[PDB]
């Protein structure tokens, strides 16, 4: 499936997506792009939408 993320660092906000075949696979992944970019904070996940959210 498709997962997508909501990065939120405040001025900088960021949407990427993700073919994984789970969504642990996506998070994982999500969890890279985040720190890449210098954000590290509160993450949520919507399994009804593959939607994961995190926000400095």
Same mark, same amino acid.
């Given at each position: 499936?498709t997962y997508k993320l909501i ?8 949407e990427t997506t @993700? ?9 994982? $992944? ?19 939408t593959k939607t994961f @959210? $995190?926000?400095?």
């Amino acid at each position: 499936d498709t997962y997508k993320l909501i990065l939120n660092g405040x001025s900088l906000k960021g949407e990427t997506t @993700t073919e994984a075949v789970d969504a642990a696979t996506a998070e994982k $992944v999500f969890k890279q792009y985040a720190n890449d970019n210098g954000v590290d904070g509160e993450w949520t996940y919507d399994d009804a939408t593959k939607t994961f @959210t $995190v926000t400095e």
